[PDB]
């Protein structure tokens, strides 16, 4: 099963539901599908989706966890988005 | 071994994983299960290059060392006939 | 800025702060008496920043002891048992200027033990094993000996109770490791043994689990901390041949198998160390010894911190470290800050109005 | 009736009436947003008026001015973080409930921040410094992150040394091109205007509060640092600095680097470039995060603030006391007015007199 | 098994066994009067023996000596005030329960007091100083009332500088005629005997603790004050002073005038007349109102006492820890004994070894 996360600028990101549950905010919004983010732009939300696949893949992983690259010019946006999304 | 990809139409981006031994047609079946369009109406590209239905992902140039969860590879998508178009993401400014 | 090197201490955790108390160290000159670190101090390690703060505690301060058992429930420390210069102790202390509180509990307290383990359930504290004098279960002699008691203490009403054991209980042992995952109270190792058991905290029924495949070498003075709802983490130990251990394992609970864990601390084996799990997918281990502890004058007690990266860090932590890294560069930059996002976050966490002044 | 105790409030005055809004007090709790408190400086009596319209959220650390009986409010910290919104309240209205107006100004506003200062020059409000988030726009000046906010705040914040001009004729933001060494980024500093000179004193930056004195020439936009020869008041933040003449600035209260509350008062002579300590009866009532307003009768009226280290919130000793510093000789009418009121049993302004006679009725 | 924590106890030793009695600890509470605790200095193990007969009341501040394995006890403060009774306990008895004997001595005893010192010379016990009531008899020396006791105690008390001789052959009190300037009246001082010289250091008098060093010649009865050139330990009371050679005195712990606990150790060289600070691992374990006993293997064994200011009784951190200061090279037999015990897994005195192995049984 897949879910769709929609950024402020209208991009649609379709990710695995299990991956989207990495964010506590998305998990609470789905619990009872689509989720709308009127204040998160696509260049931020796309990075969040990459973290979703990265976090799930390397959870309980025998091999060493690689570094997650974060460009400086988006670090503060990503930190606020991550705190809002709770992941 | 798995490859992590981004299947991108105009403003739709699909995050999914597959095996490099898997074929392009199998990937089109995955897109069919999400966007509800049969494989015979899709068109998968590698950044400018048409992907044959019979070729595998590894034979297309996708390697597990270049399609990682933190940096997934990009596959273009076109529906039937249409020109391949992927609108870019927003800019930091 | 840093606690003195020690072994046999206790370290408890709330996720972001690690509290360290007690233990003992070897004197510079060879002798026949151990040096127990001051009872008055309690060390707090912040796992986000990596610095220590020492606070001196008044009140009903427990004596300086080693091999004690501690648990952190809602940032309230519970301390039982241990060993000091006069002998073993069965006194129970609690700790929320901070004040230790010596509580006179209802029921019958256990005997004076040390090198035991403890589990935490809904509001019950469950202690198991140990080593000490003569007072349910058995008590094998070595005047002290190994223990099998499973004493339970209710934190709501402070009554010492013992459960009805169903199934085969484990053998007498001390210096074992205990970990809690849901309603399972795990035991492993000790004496160096290799058996793996768990007790159903709900039904109070003992179970024996036999992993298949490659298993960790039998060890004592090891550490076992849960890193997930389906994974346990074992590091260090003490073999039967007394060879110090610097290896780490991950035990999958559902699949009931063992996998070796690679880390950059292969050159720093530890025994009688503490281990605590952080909220950022890390195992923080502190203290312990690298040399052979049986020879006290030749013991090499450590005060170092070893951090194992068992799980990926959160996006918040990863982004914040990027911000901390590019501090000077970003101070000359600018970025959008949508008010609804900021207000949602500050609704969850609050905002301090006195900062920067 | 009686405004509740508060710190971090704003207080502005026309020389006769003091307008008090906002602030916070411990049970944290911000005081009601719709209440405007007017303190009559002649009669010493308080009055409450309710407000309407685009009422600002309850905030501490906001920056306020009174120009021609118009109240202007910028910045501050509400319960959901810092803001950069700008509000106007015209006290000349005859409405029973005064109407707040939030102005969408032209140009690029400053960053969201609080605990700053402001100078009032010809048709402009000039804001300086403060503490808050990173700017959302390109801005002339320096921002510096507060390293303690990375692990203890929901979003990093820091100090700035920005200068922003709000033209009250058109409500347009701008930034002057300045010369000379600007003061370091700071917050909880104190600003005072004398003619074309905008003085700034003290504040907190990185670690440790300061006692440097600077002024920005509001015509040439040239920064200047004053190095007074002789003794100076100790470094502080959360102090008040009020002009009491064309040549003198009055400083009271504050917070030392070692977290000690202050009850010392000083006068700085602009021409002589020297400080003189001021004797007053409030040595046992230190104040920090208070407000100070100059009266038309040579008095500085101090309101609110905390007597002790308010960084511990549950033990903060917030106050609603009025502290009156007599720094200039009063008018003979006022002195004779006080004399007549002092002897009412022995003999409109005399009729209103004062309030709260603790001796009457015995 | 394990003697409970206490301060104000007495500890005496023959060089091999330490005898511990009395003291008090917070719940105030005096420890059981009939218990005698014997600490074996070779094995480091405690033993409890019960006593009978004229058992003294439980007291703190008593003065005790061990001469030829006989325990002598004078003075102290029980729950009903100070006393001047004298007790003897012969540890050489084979009784399962040792019999205390209260001796009615000949002559005039000293005043009822506690917290004093004693020197052991040829066949005599020489007591000095203390704190307690006014004497009940004519006495050579000076008494000085403690002005704080008039309004805070059930009966006035004070310090004295009295010297009293108890001849152990006949159990007769007397007072020598002394020459030179005696030390001021004091309590909680420390006494140490080396040959015919009875040293006294520190103590409290009127206001403020002291660090003066005096000695009374026990042959000529001539007081002398030593003024060491160079550094000296700070003024203190409730310290311990133990001879560790024919020429050296060892000082540990105490209580400053500013009520600070002390963990410093010093050695005083009698011939050189100078102090040298002693490095030890107990810098974080200050002690006051503790006891110190010299071992036959060059160690000073410290027991009991309080880690903090015990003048606040409910927050007093009483202790039962044993603190061992290695001040002289041990015998090779003892060193080789420790080596064999240190390696029991690799290889009667070796059999008994030590106690409380925290590592065994893992």
Q: Using alpha carbons only, give the angle A26, A27, A33 rounded to the nearest 5 degrees.
A: 70
Q: What is the DSSP letter of E142?
A: -
Residue ranges per domain, chain B?
2-93
- Token pair 């040595």 is found at D283
Using only C-alpha atoms, chain D has a radius of gyration, in whole angstroms, of 20
CA distance C238 to chain A (A): 24
Calpha distance C318→A76 (Å, rounded): 11
Q: Between C315-325 and A75-85, two packed helices, what is the crossing angle to 10 degrees?
A: 160
Pairing of strands A34-36, B12-19: unpaired
Distance of CA E82 to the CA centre of its chain: 18
Pairing of strands C58-59, C99-102: parallel
Residue ranges per domain, chain A?
1-87
Calpha distance D18→D45 (Å, rounded): 10
| Element containing residue C321 per DSSP (H, E) | helix C315-325
Q: Which residues of A touch D155 (CB under 8 A)?
A: 79-80, 83
Count of all residues that appear for chain A in the document: 87
Structure token pair of residue C133: 């004098």
Q: Is B48 strand, coil or helix?
A: coil
Q: How many CB pairs under 8 A join A and C?
A: 86
Calpha distance C234→C129 (Å, rounded): 19
Give me the DSSP letters along E345-356: S---HHHH--S-
Nearest to C232 by CA among C252, C215, C247, C248: C252
- Token pair 């009774």 is found at E85
Question: What is the end-to-end Cα distance of chain B in Å, rounded?
Answer: 38
Query: Smallest Cβ distance to B90: which of A13, A42, A52?
Result: A42
Calpha distance E66→E73 (Å, rounded): 9
The strand order across the sheet containing C88-95 reads: C58-59, C99-102, C88-95, C76-83, C69-73
Calpha distance C330→E185 (Å, rounded): 71
Give me the DSSP letters along E174-187: E----BS-PPPPBB
Experimental method: X-ray
CA distance D134 to chain A (A): 9
CB crowding C233-259: b at 16 or more within 10 Å, else e: bbbbbbeeeeebbbbbbbbebeeeebe
Q: Which residues of C touch E46 (CB under 8 A)?
A: 86
Calpha distance E109→D208 (Å, rounded): 65
CB C185 within 8 A of CB C198: yes
Nearest to C219 by CA among C180, C188, C257, C253: C188
CB E31 within 8 A of CB E4: yes
Q: Provide the chain D residues 3-32 that lie in CB contact (below 8 A) with chain A.
A: none
Using only C-alpha atoms, chain C has a radius of gyration, in whole angstroms, of 21
- Token pair 């009850």 is found at D263
Hey, which residues does C148 pair with through a beta bridge?
A: none
Calpha distance D333→D254 (Å, rounded): 34
Calpha distance C71→C288 (Å, rounded): 18
Q: Which residues of E touch C145 (CB under 8 A)?
A: 361
Q: Is the minimum CB–CB distance between D10 and chain C shorter than 8 Å?
A: no
CB crowding E61-82: b at 16 or more within 10 Å, else e: bbbbbbeeeebbbbbbbbeeeb
Nearest to C119 by CA among C107, C105, C108, C129: C129
How deeply is D227 buried, as exposed, middle or buried, from its count of CB atoms within 10 A (0-12, 13-18, 19+)?
Answer: exposed
Other Cβ atoms within 10 Å of E166 Cβ, number: 25
Q: Is B24 strand, coil or helix?
A: helix
Is B in contact with A (3 or more beta carbon pairs below 8 Å)? yes
Contact B11 A11 (CB under 8 A): yes
The residues, ordered by sequence, that sit 6+ positions from A18 with a Cβ below 8 Å of its Cβ are A56
Pairing of strands C159-161, C106-107: parallel
Q: What is the 3-state secondary structure (H, E, C) of E196-212?
A: CEEEEECCECCCCEECC
Contact C312 A84 (CB under 8 A): no
How deeply is D14 buried, as exposed, middle or buried, from its count of CB atoms within 10 A (0-12, 13-18, 19+)?
Answer: middle
Give me the DSSP letters along E293-309: EE-TTSEEEEE--BSS-
Q: Which residues of D touch A83 (CB under 8 A)?
A: 154-155
Pairing of strands E81-82, C69-73: unpaired
Give the resolution to one decimal, in Å.
2.6
Cα separations in angstroms, E318 against C68, C80, E310: 21, 21, 8
Query: Smallest Cβ distance to C312: which of A59, A79, A84?
Result: A59
- Token pair 């061990």 is found at E66
Calpha distance D74→D110 (Å, rounded): 10
How deeply is E42 buried, as exposed, middle or buried, from its count of CB atoms within 10 A (0-12, 13-18, 19+)?
Answer: middle
Contact C32 E341 (CB under 8 A): yes
Calpha distance E86→E172 (Å, rounded): 11
We find that the CATH architecture of domain B2-93 is Roll (3.10)
Structure token pair of residue B11: 């403003």
Structure token pair of residue D270: 């602009």
Against chain E, the chains showing at least 3 CB pairs within 8 Å are C
Using only C-alpha atoms, chain B has a radius of gyration, in whole angstroms, of 13
Distance of CA E344 to the CA centre of its chain: 36
């Amino acid at each position: 099963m897949y879910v769709k996360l929609i950024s402020s600028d209208g991009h649609e990101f379709i990710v695995k539901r299990e991956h989207a549950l990495t964010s506590g905010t998305i998990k609470a919004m789905l619990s009872g599908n689509e989720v709308n983010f009127r204040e998160i732009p696509s260049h931020v939300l796309s990075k969040v989706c990459m973290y979703f696949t990265y976090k799930v893949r390397y959870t309980n992983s025998s091999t060493e966890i690689p570094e997650f690259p974060i460009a400086p010019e988006i670090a503060l946006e990503l930190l606020m988005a991550a705190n809002f999304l709770d992941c | 071994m798995d490859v992590f990809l981004m299947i991108r139409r105009h403003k739709t981006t699909i995050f999914t994983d597959a095996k490099e031994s898997s074929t392009v047609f199998e990937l089109k079946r995955i897109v069919e299960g999400i966007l509800k369009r049969p494989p015979d109406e899709q068109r998968l590209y590698k950044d400018d290059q048409l992907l044959d239905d019979g070729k595998t992902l590894g034979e297309c140039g996708f390697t597990s060392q270049t399609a990682r969860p933190q940096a997934p590879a990009t596959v273009g998508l076109a529906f039937r006939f249409e020109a391949l178009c992927i609108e870019p993401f927003s800019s930091p400014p | 800025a840093c606690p003195a090197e020690r072994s046999g201490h206790v370290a408890v955790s709330d996720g972001r702060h690690m509290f360290v108390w007690g233990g003992y160290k070897s004197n510079q000159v060879r002798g026949l008496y151990d040096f127990y670190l001051p009872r008055e101090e309690l060390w707090i390690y912040n796992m986000e920043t990596g610095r220590w703060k020492k606070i001196n505690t008044e009140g009903d301060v427990p004596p300086s002891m080693s091999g004690s058992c501690a648990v952190c429930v809602d940032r309230v420390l519970y301390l039982f048992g241990g060993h000091h210069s006069r002998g073993n102790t069965n006194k129970f202390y609690m700790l929320d200027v901070l004040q230790w509180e010596r509580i006179d509990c209802q029921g019958i307290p256990p005997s004076s033990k040390d090198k035991l383990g403890v589990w935490v359930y809904k509001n019950k504290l469950i202690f198991f094993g140990g080593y000490g004098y003569l007072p349910l279960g058995t008590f094998e002699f070595d005047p002290r000996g190994w223990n099998d008691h499973v004493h339970i203490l209710d934190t709501e009403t402070f009554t010492w109770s013992q459960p009805i054991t169903t199934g085969k209980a484990p053998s007498p042992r001390a210096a074992h490791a205990c970990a809690t995952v849901g309603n399972r109270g795990f035991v492993f190792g000790g004496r160096r043994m290799n058996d793996l058991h768990y007790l159903n905290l709900d039904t109070w029924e003992w179970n024996e689990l036999i992993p298949q495949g490659i298993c960790p070498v039998g060890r004592s003075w090891h550490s076992l901390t849960p890193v997930s709802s389906d994974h346990l983490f074992l590091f260090g130990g003490f073999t039967t041949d007394k060879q110090p251990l610097s290896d780490a394992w991950t035990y999958c609970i559902s699949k009931n198998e063992w996998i070796q864990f690679n880390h950059p601390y292969t050159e720093k084996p530890r025994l009688w160390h503490t281990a605590c799990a952080s909220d950022e997918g890390e195992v923080i281990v502190f203290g312990g010894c690298a040399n052979n502890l049986l020879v006290h004058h030749r013991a090499a007690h450590s005060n170092e911190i070893l951090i194992f990266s068992v799980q990926p860090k959160s996006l918040v932590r990863l982004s914040l470290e990027a911000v901390i890294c590019f501090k000077e560069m970003l101070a000359n930059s600018w970025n959008c800050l949508p008010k609804h996002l900021l207000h949602s976050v500050n609704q969850r966490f609050g905002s301090n109005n006195t900062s920067g002044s």
